[PDB]
Design a binder for these strands. Structure first.
Ligand SMILES: [K+]
Ligand SMILES: [K+]
Ligand SMILES: [K+]
Ligand SMILES: [K+]
Ligand SMILES: [K+]
Ligand SMILES: [K+]
Ligand SMILES: [Mg+2]
Ligand SMILES: [Mg+2]
Ligand SMILES: [Mg+2]
Ligand SMILES: [Mg+2]
Ligand SMILES: [Mg+2]
Ligand SMILES: [Mg+2]
Ligand SMILES: [Mg+2]
Ligand SMILES: [Mg+2]
Ligand SMILES: [Mg+2]
Ligand SMILES: [Mg+2]
Ligand SMILES: [Mg+2]
Ligand SMILES: [Mg+2]
Ligand SMILES: [Mg+2]
Ligand SMILES: [Mg+2]
Ligand SMILES: [Mg+2]
Ligand SMILES: [Mg+2]
Ligand SMILES: [Mg+2]
Ligand SMILES: [Mg+2]
Ligand SMILES: [Mg+2]
Ligand SMILES: [Mg+2]
Ligand SMILES: [Mg+2]
Ligand SMILES: [Mg+2]
Ligand SMILES: [Mg+2]
Ligand SMILES: [Mg+2]
Ligand SMILES: [Mg+2]
Lengths: 110, 97, 288, 85, 245, 95, 87
RNA sequence: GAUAGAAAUUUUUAUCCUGACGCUAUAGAGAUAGUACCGUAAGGGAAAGAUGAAAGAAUAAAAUAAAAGUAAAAAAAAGCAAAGAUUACCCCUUCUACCUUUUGCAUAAUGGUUUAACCAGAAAAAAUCUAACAAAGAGAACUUUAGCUAGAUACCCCGAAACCAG
């Protein structure tokens, strides 16, 4: 897979925004995909269960969970139900919040 | 239900013979060999079962296709009866349907 | 990073004696033994249930089945002969360019899209190419010379706004299989064959200048291009004054498959050499 | 246990050994050539490709000869290449 | 020093370089190991899948018992159904009878062939190397030469350095293995020499100590890190590719 | 339904279903009303209109027809000038 | 112990014996010879002239494509007749 | 209707590395053997072996003394044969054998003298669980508007009168 070419202006017309040059001074870290996109995906089970999955997380995952909980708290009025999978490094959030999370992680530079 | 009254000679199995020490050495030939030989090209056994898997019906059908013309008369008949019975049982019998 | 590696120093060595599958990955199998799963084995009591001779699927017991009392109508009549076109959106076309999957410096055709993993074409499933859709016409800021098999009015207008070139060409399934997978074809040791003409049904689509057909009369393109510019209210760029005019004007002969190659050529990939015929009949047949 | 050579080739390999091997080559060459005989009963179709009247599509067609039984009485005369159907 | 680009947010892991030319010729240098291979996540359940896969991907059973159809005889009804006074039977080869077949037995040669996806197998090698390094079971040997062909030399060398009971020696290529090492390890059971292409999960877990040669370490990192940023195979990689010969 | 064929060992399909049903990619099946060509002079204007309308099939019928046809007919198809092309995907379904 | 030599796929061309009765049928077809040329070519030892259709084959190819695939002029005029007829 | 089902066109690198998550005398071939034996004939077709280094160590030696069945040792009011117990086996008190089949069986409805050996749930389209990678997945050929690939979870045994060919 070729590396993304350097652009004079960001974000690109397709919305793609390259990661910040320095690593953010945060405990957890979220690797980019092999296609250079934020690894936030939807997942549906039983036809009525809607979940959002954050993959490829290194470091203190519990820091990521707490930052997600108070980020989505004002939007919902309650702490969202989350699952932490340390053996894999995946945070699972009940509901369709993929678009909101991708913008949130992009601002933090992951 | 009578059991044997004498202790059998204990089998002294050596875990480090030639077979066990070199077991599964070249399983990653494709990954670490520029993808020149798939790991299915190391299987030793029947001609029709090298790198293939299936249930009992698909196995008997596959055997008849490849080595059918090389089988004996009696074996060729027994295979045909096995195919017919499995064909009738799998399609015309069972619980979930 | 992986703080679990610190825990591994204290723990004993990992060997074949202590390995456990992921919990929940292997549901245990239930066998018909014991009081619970016994004396009936989950079949029933008499009838065609316990003896396993219930009727076929869709049989309602003598009554006319649901799938036999509905009158026949043609929903899949001739579906195996209808042409299919994989849609490509300008949102995805912009996405590919920004990430370097494809480059606008070099002309883009169906082959370059496949190598860029943009679209996947299955010639066997009656796919005749890629159609351009106008899903992302508003945010399309690229300048490309793209060649597809079907285009829409808004998709053409969006590309021509930035100063691109759009052309529609027809590919026979025999040729389309070669075009989408060129390397496997070159390993078959066969001469490159001529591209076949579109059938009588598809002649008007590729002959009119409104669709930017490859077989269309070039004299009517400039007046057709200006109609789109007038219709959508965008100033038509003068493409002849750009430094990439040589690249943007590149086309293919109707009997030609690849760029710069000719029918009858044999590509010997092992020796990195190209073979060409010499007989008059061979040259005439591959060029007629 | 399986035969190394398929059963269908046993008769062909019978000709490659023994007295059959010393037979003149010209006789053997004519014997091994199994050319399809001239159609007598069935009526063949000239075109290799045909258009389906129902489907209106180009399809491939092949002539399949109709088996014919030749009684031993025929070998004593000249029936013109035909027999019981 | 690592050649392939190390990710910015992490740093390479380092390990001592040893030599086999002497008992005390240890710690003769320092080598950097790529974090994405030798410092990856400790997946102890992706090793279970690969370890089981290497055991049940070539197993072809050879058990075939004869069902009631394939038994020699029993083609006739033994006695008339009504009036005899005994239980009704239809053949003397049914599974009830003494000499009958098997109603449900192993039928023919059964093949257990299933292929895990390639990225799981590659992930299996990465975690095994990380586990070996994290538990001090990985030693790097420079160029893998031995003073003598006597097999007793390796036994005492491993005893002095506490290399455990079994040691797995690797080399980059088969024809390039030196004669001293080949002759020394050809007479030992717990010590085995395998080319770099013959490395896998089961061999690592079988031997309590893994020894990697410096040329092989660069070979492994080049092959295992290629899958992180690759495309799905349009056609098999044995066929020519633009940048993968 | 032939679960396992005798030539290739795959799963066959029932040609009766495809000749009189249309499967949308959302899982819904489409069919014609029964009796839309029989005795039209007898039926009223409203009744004839009702019989000429396409209708959907409930869950049991939809589930039944999915086990009678193979996986070739469940694929995503992009036909040219397909009237039902816009009905393939479901939208605004709050279940 | 010492491991067995790794299994390697040789890059040399292969040619089965045509006179062997046990050879596979697909290994004597003309398609196999062309595939060897595309694989090796220089080491295949097959004349490059065999890759193009012969004069007998070329006449067959010329007739089949002419009778079944019409010309652009024929297609254009055929549609004009139908358009005039329907109008 | 049940079901039957191609082709055009594609793919396939050689020799060694071969042995066993196959059985161990009701298993595995029927086999110690198509022999005894039953049939005029075609045909059907078995059960059966065990000491030790030496039996040219048979006043010979070692091993479990553990299936049903008997002996050592016949029985003493009263009862689905046992339990609650009791200083005490009974005596006392309390309990309508077991499976199958039925609206309902101690039923006088079915089957079993008892013992050992042998004898009956099998398939992965859709789905749920776990994981890899993710707008893409898969070691070609396909599926894709969070999907694709891999694993795990599944559907028995005995029996007719008959029918056809030699
Ligand atoms: K079934
Ligand atoms: K039960
Ligand atoms: K027997
Ligand atoms: K009775
Ligand atoms: K009864
Ligand atoms: K009973
Ligand atoms: Mg999902
Ligand atoms: Mg169950
Ligand atoms: Mg089961
Ligand atoms: Mg019971
Ligand atoms: Mg019952
Ligand atoms: Mg009933
Ligand atoms: Mg009726
Ligand atoms: Mg497709
Ligand atoms: Mg029989
Ligand atoms: Mg009979
Ligand atoms: Mg019977
Ligand atoms: Mg037996
Ligand atoms: Mg026996
Ligand atoms: Mg036994
Ligand atoms: Mg006893
Ligand atoms: Mg009493
Ligand atoms: Mg009662
Ligand atoms: Mg009653
Ligand atoms: Mg009942
Ligand atoms: Mg009774
Ligand atoms: Mg009764
Ligand atoms: Mg009785
Ligand atoms: Mg499934
Ligand atoms: Mg009849
Ligand atoms: Mg008869």
């Amino acid at each position: 897979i070729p590396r993304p070419p350097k652009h004079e202006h960001y974000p690109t017309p397709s919305g793609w925004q390259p990661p910040r040059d320095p690593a953010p001074s945060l405990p957890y870290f979220v690797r980019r995909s092999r296609m250079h996109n934020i690894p936030v995906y939807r997942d549906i089970t039983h036809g009525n269960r809607q979940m959002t999955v954050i993959r490829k997380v290194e470091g203190d995952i519990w820091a990521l969970q707490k930052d997600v909980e108070d980020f989505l708290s004002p939007l919902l009025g309650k702490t969202p139900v989350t699952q932490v999978n340390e053996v894999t490094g995946t945070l699972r959030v009940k509901g369709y919040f993929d678009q909101q999370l991708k913008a949130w992680l992009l601002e933090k530079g992951f | 239900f009578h059991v044997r009254v004498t202790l059998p000679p204990r089998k002294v199995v050596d875990r480090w013979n030639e077979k066990r020490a070199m077991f599964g050495v070249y399983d990653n030939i494709g990954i670490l060999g520029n993808f020149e030989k798939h790991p299915k090209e190391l299987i030793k056994g029947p001609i029709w079962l090298r790198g293939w898997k299936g249930n009992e019906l698909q196995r008997c059908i596959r055997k008849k296709r490849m080595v059918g013309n090389r089988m004996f008369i009696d074996d060729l008949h027994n295979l045909n009866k096995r195919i017919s019975y499995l064909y009738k049982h799998f399609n015309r019998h069972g619980k979930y349907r | 990073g992986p703080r679990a590696l610190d825990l591994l120093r204290a723990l004993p060595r990992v060997s074949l004696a202590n390995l456990k599958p992921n919990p929940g990955s292997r549901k245990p199998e239930r066998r018909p033994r014991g009081r619970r799963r016994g004396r009936k084995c989950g079949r029933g009591h008499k009838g065609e249930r316990q003896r396993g001779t219930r009727p076929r699927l869709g049989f309602e017991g003598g009554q006319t089945p649901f799938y036999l009392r509905i009158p026949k109508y043609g929903f899949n009549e001739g579906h195996s002969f209808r042409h299919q076109y994989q849609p490509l959106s300008l949102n995805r076309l912009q996405y590919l360019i920004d990430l370097g999957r494809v480059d606008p410096t070099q002309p883009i055709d169906l082959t370059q899209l496949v190598n860029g993993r943009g679209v996947t074409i299955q010639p066997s499933k009656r796919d005749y190419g890629v159609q351009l859709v106008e899903e992302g016409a508003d945010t399309f800021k690229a300048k490309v010379n793209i060649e597809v098999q079907m285009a829409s009015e808004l998709a053409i207008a969006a590309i021509e706004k930035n100063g691109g070139v759009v052309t529609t060409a027809f590919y026979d399934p025999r040729s389309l299989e070669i075009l989408c997978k060129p390397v496997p074809f070159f390993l078959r040791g066969q001469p490159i064959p001529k591209r076949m003409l579109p059938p009588e049904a598809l002649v008007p689509y590729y002959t009119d200048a409104k669709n930017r057909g490859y077989l269309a009369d070039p004299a009517r393109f400039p007046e057709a291009r200006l109609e789109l510019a007038r219709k959508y209210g965008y100033v038509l760029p003068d493409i002849t004054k750009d430094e990439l005019f040589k690249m943007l004007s590149t086309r293919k002969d109707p009997r030609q498959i690849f760029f710069g190659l000719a029918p009858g050529w044999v590509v010997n990939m092992a020796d990195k050499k190209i073979l060409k015929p010499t007989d008059e009949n061979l040259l005439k047949y591959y060029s007629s | 246990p399986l035969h190394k050579v398929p059963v269908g080739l046993w008769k062909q390999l019978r000709l490659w050994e023994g007295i059959y091997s010393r037979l003149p080559r010209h006789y053997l060459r004519s014997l091994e050539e199994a050319r399809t005989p001239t159609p007598v009963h069935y009526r063949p179709h000239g075109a290799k490709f045909k258009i389906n009247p129902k489907n209106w599509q180009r399809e491939r067609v092949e002539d399949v000869p109709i088996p014919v039984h030749y009684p031993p009485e025929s070998q004593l005369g000249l029936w013109g290449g035909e027999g019981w159907v | 020093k690592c050649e392939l680009p190390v990710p910015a947010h992490r740093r390479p892991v380092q390990a001592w370089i040893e030599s086999l030319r002497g008992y005390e010729q240890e710690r003769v240098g320092l080598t950097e190991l790529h974090p994405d291979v030798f410092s990856t996540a400790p997946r102890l359940d992706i090793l279970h899948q690969v370890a089981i896969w290497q055991k049940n991907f070539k197993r072809i059973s050879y058990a075939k018992t004869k069902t009631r159809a394939e038994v020699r005889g029993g083609g006739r009804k033994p006695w008339v159904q009504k009036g005899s006074g005994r239980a009704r039977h239809g053949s003397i080869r049914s599974p009830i009878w003494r000499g009958g077949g098997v109603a449900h037995g192993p039928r023919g040669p059964t093949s257990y062939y299933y292929m895990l996806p390639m990225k799981v197998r590659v992930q299996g090698l990465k975690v095994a190397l990380t586990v070996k390094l994290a538990q001090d079971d990985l030693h790097i040997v420079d160029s893998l030469e031995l003073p003598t062909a006597d097999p007793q030399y390796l036994i005492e060398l491993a005893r002095y350095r506490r290399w455990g009971d079994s040691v797995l020696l690797v080399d980059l290529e088969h024809e390039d293995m030196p004669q001293n090492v080949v002759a020394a390890t050809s007479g030992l059971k717990t010590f085995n020499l395998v080319p770099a292409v013959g490395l896998n999960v089961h061999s690592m877990l079988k031997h309590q100590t893994l020894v990697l040669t410096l040329p092989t370490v660069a070979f492994l990192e080049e092959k295992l890190l290629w899958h992180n940023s690759r495309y799905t195979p349009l056609y098999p990689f044995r066929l020519p590719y633009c940048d993968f010969p | 339904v032939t679960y396992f064929s005798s030539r290739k060992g795959k799963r066959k399909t029932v040609k009766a279903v495809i000749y009189r049903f249309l499967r949308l990619h959302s899982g819904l099946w489409l069919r014609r009303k029964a009796g839309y060509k029989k005795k039209l002079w007898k039926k009223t204007a409203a009744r004839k209109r009702r019989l000429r309308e396409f209708v959907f099939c409930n869950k049991t019928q939809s589930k039944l027809l999915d086990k009678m046809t193979t996986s070739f007919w469940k694929r995503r198809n992009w036909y040219a000038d397909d009237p039902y092309q816009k009905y393939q995907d479901r939208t605004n379904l709050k279940v | 112990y010492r491991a067995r030599p790794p299994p390697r796929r040789s890059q040399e061309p292969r040619w089965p014996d045509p006179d062997d009765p046990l050879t596979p049928r697909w290994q004597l077809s003309p398609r196999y010879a062309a595939k060897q040329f595309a694989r090796h070519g220089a080491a295949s030892g097959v004349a490059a002239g065999s890759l193009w259709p012969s004069q007998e084959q070329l006449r067959e190819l010329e007739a089949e494509e002419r009778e079944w695939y019409p010309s652009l002029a024929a297609m254009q005029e055929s549609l004009r007749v139908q358009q005039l007829a329907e109008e």
